[PDB]
């Protein structure tokens, strides 16, 4: 209280010297705990012990010596905001301090303190034009750095988990299993953005920083809590109110009051996770109603059927603004209490520090550096409450993904039929049962071998097993029984499917499916289209729009026959194949095919009696269990 | 400058029985002006222009009486905010202003105005005790309302889209027009929300307010400039720079201030719409391509076609990962120009009533009071281009909903096929003629006339013109000429499809597909799967799971003699529908249709020789043009 000019707090010369070395020690001891709070929460917490499953590989082996370097820089980033907060209150301390000297000069008749209490107030502008340099070169040297980060773990995620879901065959095998899950799609596209982003159940938009991520805005405000402690510890008062008598009242009475709006504040959003898991499921099986129906569009032309369809969207569409009616009302009860705790305490500082502003205590300096104090580890304490709710969606972001991972590991442990390479060219087979998942029967064990010239048709009833036995036959269907020795190989087993598929892209790649783009010489893949009376197309090899309803369906199945050729198996199955085309131009396919391709074991299934001139033994299924095979004559 | 004991500003006490009026006099004068300033931009801004046309119905018409009374109250929930934040600042300059008498008398020696300063001091609190209840029972009484509007704008526009979609027969004739569209799954189900929610780019999240909404973030700042002006035109001085002499300097260098700032940041967030347009198509045309291969699971498993598909993702992915990364490139240039510039003018006002503070000429209240000002006329001026990238997505999700009502516009006037109704049964046509859109020929001006009793099959080649003559007589393909005469009415004419087609829902809605679900006796549903072989799926009618994969291809034509028979039409048209049943079952079901229903005119379209011992004229396509029409004998 000293009727001196001016006293500055630090001396602003061996200033930033001195703020240098204060970095370097608070990076250290602030990495080396918070490795070691990252690995206590891997192990015992039921939320993040699901997250190191999902994103192992990336944080480990011998790449992940990059991700780390760039990871290390951002608490710099976050050291170097404190440190700028903290002395953003010690210049405020100076201007509340001269600006006491500069009134009371005037008022006393002092000549010499009104002249040198004002010097004080044009050397706290100027720290404030170099502290505010800083403060914009700082946010927007950030923004760059943490937007090239989640780039490079997005395409690196989105990559790893395509590849593990069509891996082993796990695309199809998950229909089958007990707790099944639904639309994948989802997964992929949408919810790997939020996983990765961190931001709240919202997709990233290139302005997030650092100040709005949900692990980096907690150690933010933890150095921040630790380092404002110093200065409120030393100024708080003995307020003696009625009973017992508080040592420091200021300091300990924050810590008790976060303390009981922050257990209130958990058990008002405890079933808050559960409606956010709810509404990306019912938005996600509406988005799927609309997909079938485009590409579906011409068999709904021809059946008028548009008041049977109006009215499935509006039963699949009403659950879900239904879903959303008591989420709000749940979000605005939590959300108006941490407004009103948050509010009641902004004029506390004020009136426990006022008797001692009008009596010489202290020099209203402290006051307004009590209160921007208060005003800080109030609210930086108040993060685990104020971001509950951003972190509730982001829960949902866990579960939905790990329902993934783990539903194709429990995809390929269903029983199979067991194959084994032949020595040259036979397919036999020594026993072989077939179900469906109700438990009834419908092949009972049966043997037959063929050699490397042959043949075999396999007819029987309207729909009772005739494709379920082609279906198990190409480790596809998990309900059977047996053994298979196969002429195998890469790709020595080429089968085809009861309705016809083409692929996405270019006319280049429609015709040549399994094998790739560039390993067919050009010269002769419009020779052996001629073959096959495709001459109209031999042009346009080069075109991009969809096929899918471009060709006719009698067209796909003579472009089939050229897939055939082009890769020259020796095991192919082959059922339908001739659904539609006339009598005339089939025996001239097969004739075709016997005669460029000596030996291939052709197995068919077929209905129409004009086959059974070209297949040497015959397979005829009663329905129910008894088969007769016999060789055909005449 | 009096040496009063204090003064307050405003009364206080008849304070708020004169600020209720000041708010019936700012809320018509509010409202009688935004209703011209709205209707002005409707008519003369290409922004504004196709608003009107997208949601023209909700707001006209009898029953749009309740959402303009909606609409009103949140006129007064903002006149309601602005004028707290006039009387925060009243309030704040009286602390400023007691801290000075309780300075200086404690200097000069004063024992009447230190104790009858202070006094004002717990008068400050007193009005901070009231003004901070009525701020945290607005904004929670704000939350409540404004997540009551928007709901019923949504529930309205997805209804209102989607039975213009699908009215005309316009889901299938959209492939034909000329500036083709592309998924519209993503404007019904994702981008009615962005443009309902009227935020940003984003979806709604149930904690947005008044004040984060692009129409009502700008009457908020509009109010709060024009209330704020009558401070500070009488508080500035005459600051003699070199040169002229200025007359009032601090109101009008703001003014010049944010028009240089406000052009530059237009020009540079100017192409930044056409890099948000592009990243809702990139992330749509991505989802499709997953859902296109889950439902074709059975198809690639056959052909282990897993490394040409794994090709096509990773061609459909990575421009989306590289239009981001120039779009990151451009919304930190715009984002660091409009930081740069709301940080350098907030040192002004302590600088320019600096000396006059020192000198008697004020009195310390009203440079903190000129500082809240200058901090708020300023900021609410910066709203024009503090959020205009928040601007540009918005616009960009009018273009993306505009190219679909203007798509099914032009989907309808495209040439088709005339009909009219007969008088009692006959089919007959006079002369049809159908091409391609390369522009080639099929079938030249035929004619054909079929009574009461009769029958036709088609047969041809391969893929020359058999559907597509079906395809154009049914008002369902564009290129075509002539007329019809059918025997018409609601459905009395049933087409069936080449491939075969089931609904969605349960298998009560799978046989009875054009009727509802509760329009047929249930006595008699299960009487009529009887003579169609159908014995043991009579029972488990009240399933739920999806019918696309579990029926065989050879099942789903079974069950469509059941849906002929449950309509009873007169003209049915049938193509294929035998493609998998044998010979035996065929014409039991034909010798079953023909006398159940006496008088229907069978018209097919068939490869196997085996029908036309059960028609009697018969029409040979030889492909080019040249048909023949013949009765059939032996
Ligand atoms: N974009 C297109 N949309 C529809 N048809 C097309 C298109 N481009 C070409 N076409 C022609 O349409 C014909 C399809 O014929 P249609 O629709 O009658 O099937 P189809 O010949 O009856 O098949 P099938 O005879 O095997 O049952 C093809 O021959 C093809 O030349
Ligand atoms: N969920 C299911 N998945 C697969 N098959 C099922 C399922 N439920 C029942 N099935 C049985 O599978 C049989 C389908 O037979 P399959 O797959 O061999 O077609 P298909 O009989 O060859 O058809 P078609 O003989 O007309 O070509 C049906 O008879 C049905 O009883
Ligand atoms: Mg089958
Ligand atoms: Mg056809």
Same mark, same amino acid.
């Given at each position: 209280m000293g009727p001196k000019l001016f006293k500055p707090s630090?001396?602003?010369?061996?200033?930033?010297? #001195?703020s240098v070395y204060w970095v370097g020690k608070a990076w250290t001891?602030?990495?080396?705990?918070?490795?070691?709070?990252?690995?206590?929460?891997r192990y015992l917490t039921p939320w993040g012990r699901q997250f190191w499953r999902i994103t192992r590989a990336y944080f480990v082996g011998p790449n992940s010596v990059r991700v780390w370097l760039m990871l290390g820089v951002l608490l710099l980033s976050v050291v170097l905001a404190v440190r700028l907060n903290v002395l953003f209150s010690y210049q405020g301390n100076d201007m509340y301090t001269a600006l006491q000297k500069a009134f009371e000069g005037?008022?006393?008749?002092?000549?010499?303190?009104?002249?040198?209490?004002?010097?004080?107030?044009?050397?706290?502008?100027?720290?404030?034009?170099?502290?505010?340099?800083?403060?914009?070169?700082?946010?927007?040297?950030?923004?760059?750095?943490?937007?090239?980060?989640?780039?490079?773990?997005?395409?690196?995620?989105?990559?790893?988990?395509?590849?593990?879901?069509?891996?082993?065959?796990?695309?199809?095998?998950?229909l089958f299993i007990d707790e099944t899950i639904d639309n994948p799609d989802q997964r992929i596209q949408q919810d790997v953005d939020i996983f990765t982003a961190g931001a709240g159940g919202t997709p990233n938009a290139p302005s997030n920083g650092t100040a709005s991520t949900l692990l980096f805005g907690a150690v933010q405000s933890i150095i921040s809590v630790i380092s404002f402690?110093?200065?409120?510890? *030393? &100024?708080?008062?003995?307020?003696?109110? %009625? +009973?017992?008598?508080?040592?420091?009242?200021?300091?300990?009475?924050?810590?008790?009051?976060?303390?009981?709006?922050?257990?209130?504040?958990?058990?008002? +959003?405890? $079933?808050?996770?559960?409606?956010?898991?709810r509404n990306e499921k019912l *938005?996600?099986?509406?988005?799927?109603?609309?997909?079938? !129906?485009?590409?579906?569009?011409?068999?709904?032309? %021809?059946?008028?059927?548009?008041?049977?369809?109006?009215?499935? !969207?509006?039963?699949?569409?009403?659950?879900?603004?239904?879903?959303?009616?008591?989420?709000?009302?749940?979000?605005?009860?939590?959300?108006?209490?941490?407004?009103?705790?948050?509010?009641?305490?902004?004029?506390?500082?004020?009136?426990i520090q006022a008797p001692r502003l009008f009596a010489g205590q202290i020099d209203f300096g402290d006051v307004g550096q009590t209160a921007t104090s208060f005003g800080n580890i109030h609210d930086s304490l108040s993060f685990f409450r104020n971001n509950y709710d951003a972190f509730a969606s982001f829960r949902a972001a866990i579960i939905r993904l790990h329902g993934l991972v783990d539903a194709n590991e429990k995809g390929r442990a269903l029983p199979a039929v067991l194959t084994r390479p032949s020595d040259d060219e036979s397919v036999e087979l020594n026993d072989i049962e077939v179900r469906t998942p109700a438990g009834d029967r419908l092949?009972? $064990?049966?043997?037959?071998?063929?050699?490397?010239?042959?043949?075999?048709?396999?007819?029987?009833?309207?729909?009772?097993?005739?494709?379920?036995?082609?279906?198990?036959?190409?480790?596809?269907?998990?309900?059977?029984?047996?053994?298979?020795?196969?002429?195998?190989?890469?790709?020595?087993?080429?089968?085809?499917?009861?309705? $016809?598929?083409?692929? !996405? +892209?270019?006319?280049? #790649?429609?015709?040549?499916?399994?094998?790739?783009?560039?390993?067919?010489?050009?010269?002769? !893949?419009?020779?052996?289209?001629?073959?096959?009376?495709?001459? $109209? &197309?031999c042009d346009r090899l080069d075109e991009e729009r969809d096929w899918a309803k471009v060709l006719s369906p009698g067209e796909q199945q003579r472009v089939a026959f050229a897939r055939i050729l082009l890769t020259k198996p020796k095991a192919v199955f082959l059922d339908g194949s001739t659904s539609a085309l006339d009598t005339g131009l089939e025996f001239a396919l097969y004739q075709l095919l016997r005669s460029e391709l000596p030996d291939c074991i052709v197995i068919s299934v077929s209905h129409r009696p004009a086959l059974e001139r070209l297949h040497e033994n015959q397979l005829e299924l009663l329905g129910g269990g008894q088969w007769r095979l016999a060789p055909v004559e005449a």
């Amino acid at each position: 209280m000293g009727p001196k000019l001016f006293k500055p707090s630090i001396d602003w010369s061996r200033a930033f010297p #001195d703020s240098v070395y204060w970095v370097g020690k608070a990076w250290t001891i602030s990495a080396i705990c918070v490795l070691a709070i990252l690995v206590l929460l891997r192990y015992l917490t039921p939320w993040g012990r699901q997250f190191w499953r999902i994103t192992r590989a990336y944080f480990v082996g011998p790449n992940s010596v990059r991700v780390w370097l760039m990871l290390g820089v951002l608490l710099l980033s976050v050291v170097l905001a404190v440190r700028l907060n903290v002395l953003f209150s010690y210049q405020g301390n100076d201007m509340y301090t001269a600006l006491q000297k500069a009134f009371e000069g005037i008022a006393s008749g002092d000549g010499t303190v009104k002249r040198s209490g004002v010097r004080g107030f044009w050397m706290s502008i100027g720290v404030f034009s170099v502290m505010a340099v800083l403060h914009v070169t700082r946010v927007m040297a950030d923004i760059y750095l943490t937007q090239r980060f989640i780039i490079a773990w997005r395409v690196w995620l989105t990559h790893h988990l395509t590849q593990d879901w069509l891996d082993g065959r796990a695309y199809y095998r998950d229909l089958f299993i007990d707790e099944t899950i639904d639309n994948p799609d989802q997964r992929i596209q949408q919810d790997v953005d939020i996983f990765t982003a961190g931001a709240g159940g919202t997709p990233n938009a290139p302005s997030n920083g650092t100040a709005s991520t949900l692990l980096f805005g907690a150690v933010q405000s933890i150095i921040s809590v630790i380092s404002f402690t110093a200065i409120l510890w *030393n &100024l708080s008062g003995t307020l003696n109110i %009625f +009973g017992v008598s508080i040592p420091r009242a200021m300091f300990w009475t924050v810590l008790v009051y976060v303390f009981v709006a922050t257990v209130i504040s958990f058990i008002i +959003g405890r $079933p808050l996770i559960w409606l956010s898991f709810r509404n990306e499921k019912l *938005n996600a099986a509406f988005r799927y109603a609309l997909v079938r !129906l485009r590409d579906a569009a011409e068999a709904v032309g %021809f059946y008028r059927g548009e008041r049977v369809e109006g009215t499935q !969207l509006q039963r699949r569409f009403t659950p879900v603004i239904d879903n959303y009616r008591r989420y709000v009302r749940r979000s605005i009860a939590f959300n108006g209490w941490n407004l009103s705790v948050s509010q009641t305490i902004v004029p506390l500082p004020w009136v426990i520090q006022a008797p001692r502003l009008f009596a010489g205590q202290i020099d209203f300096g402290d006051v307004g550096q009590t209160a921007t104090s208060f005003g800080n580890i109030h609210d930086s304490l108040s993060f685990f409450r104020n971001n509950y709710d951003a972190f509730a969606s982001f829960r949902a972001a866990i579960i939905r993904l790990h329902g993934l991972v783990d539903a194709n590991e429990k995809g390929r442990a269903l029983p199979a039929v067991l194959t084994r390479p032949s020595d040259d060219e036979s397919v036999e087979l020594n026993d072989i049962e077939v179900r469906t998942p109700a438990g009834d029967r419908l092949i009972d $064990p049966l043997d037959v071998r063929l050699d490397r010239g042959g043949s075999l048709v396999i007819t029987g009833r309207s729909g009772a097993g005739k494709t379920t036995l082609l279906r198990s036959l190409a480790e596809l269907w998990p309900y059977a029984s047996g053994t298979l020795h196969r002429p195998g190989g890469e790709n020595e087993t080429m089968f085809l499917s009861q309705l $016809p598929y083409v692929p !996405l +892209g270019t006319l280049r #790649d429609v015709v040549c499916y399994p094998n790739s783009a560039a390993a067919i010489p050009d010269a002769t !893949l419009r020779d052996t289209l001629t073959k096959v009376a495709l001459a $109209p &197309l031999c042009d346009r090899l080069d075109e991009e729009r969809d096929w899918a309803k471009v060709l006719s369906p009698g067209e796909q199945q003579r472009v089939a026959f050229a897939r055939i050729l082009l890769t020259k198996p020796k095991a192919v199955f082959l059922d339908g194949s001739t659904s539609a085309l006339d009598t005339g131009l089939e025996f001239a396919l097969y004739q075709l095919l016997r005669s460029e391709l000596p030996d291939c074991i052709v197995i068919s299934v077929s209905h129409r009696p004009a086959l059974e001139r070209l297949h040497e033994n015959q397979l005829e299924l009663l329905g129910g269990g008894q088969w007769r095979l016999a060789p055909v004559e005449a």
